[PDB]
């Protein structure tokens, strides 16, 4: 399902060459759950990135559901991105004049090719606020109306929205208290094992990557190790 | 050192109030390590907002270094932040202009003690990064050309440069992997212990929060109850 071929992603700084990937070799398959650990900037953001087309590596190649995404332009990145990826990013990225409710109907409405109506998108934007684990009361709030671990649940909750079979989350949990994550990985293990989606999560806390079949471990910009959690 | 009392903060959104905090009360003394958790929501971020001067009670009453905040004007409150607080931001909040080296030198540029030249100020700066375990290396990169945890580190470098007698830090480890966050954990302890700041830290890593002397739990925007643990 994912693929990264001898990936590499450098930065040219002044005149030293910085590597945040360095030939990187990965290979997830359909319905897999694997985490994704490693030091504070062992390249991890990177490569969820690269996985998510949402950047390009230096060199190497990457393949999502088989196809070859890494030499597609910025118009055709967007339509794969858009129908396979569901994405959490760390940083969240909620539009600020868009509430809640609002920004998780977003990227329904991008995907969906007709003309949907105000009362499935509601409802729809709802489902995923509610699997996210957010209050109702909370839909009508802006991100800057949030606290961090609500405004997290909204970011949850819009990767949800487009019912992609590959999700992508950087550190969701990283502003939840212990609980409120809990019911976040349970919500992820549910979705992978009833709906067989692939997800990959990258995460700083080890009982979050414990909910993972594999747990990858990266080391200034290499695949360190692997772990694997059940038998082969 | 830090007193709220009888703290709280109402939003009003439509014609529905919500209560971020309500009839908080709290007692921090000099040199004390105060942990601070709770459900996401609960009230921990408003509560050291306040504490740090950068939002005000709907009603209550704040004391600082024994200082009440309450009705000072907009430069007394920028002289006083600046002076006693070092505030660690949860969405870090840096300059993205500013390289993260200038990032930690702004707060320098601007401390209202005497004058710092611009060979001392950088000294300052860079030992504040190497404290906040962030390699030299990193010092010349902006914002965006940095992880989570390099941004994290930064965040936490630029509290530390006024040397303020208070530090306030809201989810410090939350982008860092735990053995950069125990690093993080022990200057926190070294300045608290050995330098006599007064600390307190938000959390929701339990790990973290035991450091501190105690632990107040926080629920719907009230003090549930107090663990203390040394
Ligand atoms: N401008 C605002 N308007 C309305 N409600 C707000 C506003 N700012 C904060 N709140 C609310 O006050 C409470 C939140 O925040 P705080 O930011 O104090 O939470 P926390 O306790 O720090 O939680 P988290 O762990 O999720 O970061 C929340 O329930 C939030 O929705
Ligand atoms: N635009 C850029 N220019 C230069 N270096 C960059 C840039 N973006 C990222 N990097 C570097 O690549 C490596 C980092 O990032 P990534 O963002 O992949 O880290 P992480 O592994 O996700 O770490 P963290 O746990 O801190 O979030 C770091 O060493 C970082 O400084
Ligand atoms: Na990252
Ligand atoms: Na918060």
Redesign the pocket.
């Known amino acids: 399902m994912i693929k990264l071929k001898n990936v590499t992603k450098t930065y040219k700084m002044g005149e030293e060459i910085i590597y945040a990937l360095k030939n990187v070799n990965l290979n997830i398959k359909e319905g897999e759950f694997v985490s994704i650990m490693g030091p504070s900037g062992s390249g991890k953001s990177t490569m969820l990135n690269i996985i998510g087309c949402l950047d390009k590596p230096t060199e190497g190649e990457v393949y999502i559901d088989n196809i070859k995404t890494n030499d597609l332009d910025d118009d055709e990145l967007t339509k794969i991105r858009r129908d396979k990826i569901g994405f959490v990013f760390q940083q969240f990225n909620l539009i600020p004049l868009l509430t809640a409710l609002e920004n998780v109907e977003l990227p329904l409405i991008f995907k969906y090719r007709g003309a949907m109506s105000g009362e499935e998108r509601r409802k729809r934007a709802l489902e995923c606020l509610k699997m996210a684990e957010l209050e109702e009361r909370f839909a009508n709030h802006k991100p800057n109306q949030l606290?961090?671990?609500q405004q997290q649940r909204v970011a949850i909750a819009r990767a949800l929205a487009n019912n992609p079979p590959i999700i992508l989350a950087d550190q969701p949990t990283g502003?939840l208290d212990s609980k409120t994550g809990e019911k976040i990985m349970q919500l992820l293990k549910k979705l992978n094992e009833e709906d067989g989606k692939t997800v990959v999560v990258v995460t700083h806390d080890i009982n979050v990557a414990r909910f993972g079949e594999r747990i990858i471990y990266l080391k200034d910009g290499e695949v360190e190790r692997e772990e694997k959690l059940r038998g082969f």
């Open positions: 606290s961090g671990g502003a």
